[PDB]
Structures are given as C-alpha cells and as structure tokens.
Design a protein around this ligand. Structure first.
Ligand SMILES: N[C@@H](CCC(=O)N[C@@H](CS)C(=O)NCC(=O)O)C(=O)O
Ligand SMILES: [Ca+2]
Length: 211
C-alpha cells in the first residue's frame, strides 16, 4: 500500500498544506491513478511515529509498499515513474531544466523590499524564457502529453501567482499569453484542484517570511 507524508497547513493539522515538492508527488500519484494514503504532518508538532521513519523531519516522504520511507521529490517521482510506467511522465532530458530558475527568482522578488534591485527583472527574464519554450513546444513542457516537468513546475507557479498578487499586487504580464494559457490549464486540472493548498493557507505560510 502506497503512502505519503506531507506538510499540513500552518495552524490546521488536518488540512492540506502548501509544499510545492509534496504537491509534485501528490500530482504524480493522482495523474498516474495510483491509490494512496496521505498522512498530514504538522511540521511544528511532528508526531514521534513520523520522526522514527523520517529522523530529520523531512517531508514529503514516500512509502511505495517496499518497507521503507524515501525523501526528495526528485527521487520520489522517479521511483513512481519506474513502478507505474503508464501514463508515461518522462520528460526528455533536453527540456528538464525548462522553468528551472522561476521559483528561486520568485522567492527573491517576493522577499525583496527594494523595488529597484533587479529581482523583478530577473524573474521576468525566466518567465519570458518559459513563454518562448511553450510557444515553440507547447501546450505542455513536452508538447501534447503532460509529463514530470509540468508536475514539478505548476506547483511553483501557483505559489508565484498567489503570493505575488497578494503581497505585492504583481501579476505575470498579460503579454506572456502562452504562460497564462499554461497556468490556467494546469491549475484547473482535477489533480491540481485536489492537491493544492487553499490560497489563504499558502498566504499564511509565506507571511512570516515576507515580513
Ligand atoms: N525564504 C525561504 C522561505 C522558507 C523555505 O524554506 N521554503 C519556502 C518555499 S517552499 C517556504 O516554505 N515558503 C512558505 C510556504 O511555502 O508556505 C525561501 O525563499 O525559500
Ligand atoms: Ca483557494
């Protein structure tokens, strides 16, 4: 029986939290139609049973039914890919780094309290790179079929959209039309709706880090 431990919403131990890494794992299981049990962990009050199988307190951790719990969403999604090959979510190596700097740039811009430090511009450069890629090879990162890269990137774009609009009133420019089509499509997938954090909980997660 497949099981995954993931972070709960801050202050709400029985509600899904907002880790994009955990969401990547949950999306992978959902899209592959793999039945799983989800255990929510209050990462500010971890239970001892959890500390025993995850001694460093890491989440997500995944139990594939083979008598062990493994961390790291990169690794976990590879294990799931190998165990449940169909639908294939393999992203070709040539596109594996598409969008790879968007999240770090987003977090730097979010936390910046200087409008002129170039953090916005850096983020825009990465979004424009995503735009050109989707333009030439969309609608997903690898064209017609959804793949791993999408399930890694979409959770991170969700954070970007929600947090930047809330805390800075900032939106991805409307002229990046392929990026907008991309986020509208990914965020409205059944799997995404099922596995995302309610926006107020994601905002609560970021609030102490913004100020
Ligand atoms: N300033 C850190 C925030 C703390 C952190 O370790 N991870 C982030 C990105 S997942 C986080 O937990 N943000 C609050 C949240 O996701 O609710 C960052 O930019 O990554
Ligand atoms: Ca919501």
């Amino acid at each position: 029986g497949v099981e995954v431990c993931v972070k709960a919403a801050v202050g709400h131990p029985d509600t899904l939290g907002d880790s994009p890494f955990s969401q990547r794992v949950l999306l992978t299981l959902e899209e592959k139609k793999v039945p799983y049990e989800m255990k929510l962990i209050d990462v500010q009050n971890k239970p001892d049973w959890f500390l025993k199988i995850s001694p460093e307190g890491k989440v997500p951790v995944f139990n594939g039914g083979d008598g062990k719990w493994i961390p790291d969403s990169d690794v976990i999604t590879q294990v799931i890919e190998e165990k449940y090959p169909t639908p294939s979510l393999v992203t070709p190596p040539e596109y594996a780094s598409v969008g790879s700097k968007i999240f770090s740039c987003f977090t730097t811009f979010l936390k910046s309290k200087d409008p002129n430090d170039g953090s916005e511009k850096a983020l825009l450069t990465e979004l424009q790179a995503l735009e050109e890629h989707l333009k030439a090879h969309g609608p997903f990162i690898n064209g017609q079929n959804i793949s791993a890269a999408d399930l890694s990137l979409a959770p991170k774009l969700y954070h970007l959209q929600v947090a930047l609009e809330h805390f800075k009133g900032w939106k991805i420019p409307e002229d990046l039309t392929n990026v907008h089509a991309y986020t509208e499509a990914l965020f409205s997938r059944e799997s995404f709706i099922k596995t995302k954090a309610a926006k107020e909980h994601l905002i609560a997660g970021w609030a102490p880090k913004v100020n």
